[PDB]
Design a protein around this ligand. Structure first.
Ligand code: N7L
Ligand code: N7L
Lengths: 304, 304
């Protein structure tokens, strides 16, 4: 029993972190096989970041200009190429610590662990969700770029995020491992509008099931609702509309607890309309949306 | 910017996790140098746990009865001994992955990361605090015993906790790495009273400084208070009494922000007396006490 915002064990990712320096800029790189992946803005000076012409800036750089260091080891760069907003630095040595891995583009509402790094060194690990508006509310300071987001399935690390920037609002933006930004963001020091965000309804429902499993039951009521009625409430409270797909993914939790999905929706409806009345759910005084139904099942069963 | 409940990178601890089996019971062990540390209740059957006589139960066990497995490797046990509530299994091989480490007994109110494990395999990592009543509100299922709590200072892992049990209330109890329980708890399946808990005042104040550093300032007011006046409020709201030692540890945050400790105490006083009025602080709708002043400084500076 107990329920925590659990991150994946970061060990397999730590073994891949390196430091990449180009000119006066230093950030983090990800060393997998004989390739180091890093944000392409490593080639920019703070002056260039206002309106960078990356193709032009990269033309002035040669393999020997990219300094890649794994702790005390210096890696020899034998190739460089830009793919979208990432630089791929071919090195002459395959990382002996390369785990089994995939590059995945996650969907909004999905969760992942971030290994925050500075100068190629891991500082900490935290679990977070990709917001419906494609931002992440992370914890990143200058030098954290190149830190990655990932999920793990037994021995396989699925890399889904690489940190590139902090918006003027203090929210974070980044790319998949092919350098495609999540959201409308560009790697330029310019004001950028993040879309209207919403709360991840299916995640809140999953978290309400986790609360029941662990003993927090006060929010359960004598009511039920329909997808249509619930969605009218979800609309008013800036929650994502619930679909049959979301109901289907909640199936295992509905089955384990014996609380029908629409009955849980009616509890969520009353919580949205009345608030928590000074009470807590799993130690939170608000409705948590950073646990997916898969996260709840995994944590509640002890999956390693 | 941004502030998260960050755990230490668990890599150095993952390299130490092993599985320990004795008879029909399996749990986690910690392999450091040529010693495997695990909870002594690995020698008990669920029947023995009601009133175990550990000295007698251990006398029936021999080195060959303790099955220690590190992933696919079987370790040869050449000695066993009980120290308080831990068993120390001497093995014939030093763990090649042993990091620099210390065994420390933490104080209540201090924080640490837990690497939750099942069958010697890491499932996840989370940050938590040792409650003033010596319990931890963790996330532990059957088979999680032997999972450890730790802090890291550059390359040194300070092991401070080993998980032994879940109280009937769903809160968790465990020992330091010499097998001494934190709190009045015993390793027996019996109802056990955890003391009256309190909120860790210095941690809440540290978190209020982190909120200011990151832009959440609405709670700052035009008032100040004294240690005596604040402690009368702390008493009423089951908060730990604030001492000059706590004020001294808050010094760096008071210096960085320019908000005097007693001025922050007056903001905390108004928050305790009036609530949050439906607002949030660093994404929380309650007063967070799981970040120490050292945690706030570390996260806010990017310490690796
Ligand atoms: C200064 C900072 C802080 C935290 N995380 C990231 C950053 N850096 C940026 O925003 C880089 C300049 C842009 C490129 F899109
Ligand atoms: C069943 C469980 C669940 C989570 N964490 C731990 C446990 N196990 C226990 O409480 C063991 C029997 C006691 C020894 F003090």
């Amino acid at each position: 029993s107990g329920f925590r915002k659990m991150a994946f064990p970061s060990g397999k990712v730590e073994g891949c972190m390196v430091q990449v320096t180009c000119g006066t800029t230093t950030l983090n790189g990800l060393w997998l096989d004989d390739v180091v992946y890093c944000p392409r803005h490593v080639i920019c000076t703070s002056e260039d970041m206002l309106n960078p012409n990356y193709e032009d800036l990269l033309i002035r750089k040669s393999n020997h200009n990219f300094l890649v260091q794994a702790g005390n080891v210096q890696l020899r760069v034998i190739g460089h190429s830009m793919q979208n907003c990432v630089l791929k630095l071919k090195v002459d040595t395959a990382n002996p610590k390369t785990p089994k891995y995939k590059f995945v583009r996650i969907q909004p509402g999905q969760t992942f662990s971030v290994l925050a790094c500075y100068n190629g060194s891991p500082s900490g690990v935290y679990q977070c969700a990709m917001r419906p508006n494609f931002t992440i509310k992370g914890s990143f300071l200058n030098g954290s770029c190149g830190s990655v987001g990932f999920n793990i399935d037994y021995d396989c690390v699925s890399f889904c995020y690489m940190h590139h920037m902090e918006l003027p609002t203090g929210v974070h933006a980044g790319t998949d491992l092919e350098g495609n930004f999540y959201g409308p963001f560009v790697d330029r020091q310019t004001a950028q509008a993040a879309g209207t965000d919403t709360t991840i309804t299916v995640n809140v429902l999953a978290w309400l099931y986790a609360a029941v499993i662990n003993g927090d039951r006060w929010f359960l009521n004598r009511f039920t609702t329909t997808l249509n009625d619930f969605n009218l409430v979800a609309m008013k409270y800036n929650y994502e509309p619930l679909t049959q797909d979301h109901v289907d993914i909640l199936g295992p939790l509905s089955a384990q607890t014996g609380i029908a999905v629409l009955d849980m929706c009616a509890s969520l409806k009353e919580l949205l309309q009345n608030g928590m009345n000074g009470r807590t759910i799993l130690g939170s005084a608000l409705l948590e949306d950073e646990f997916t139904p898969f996260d709840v099942v995994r944590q509640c069963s002890g999956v390693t």
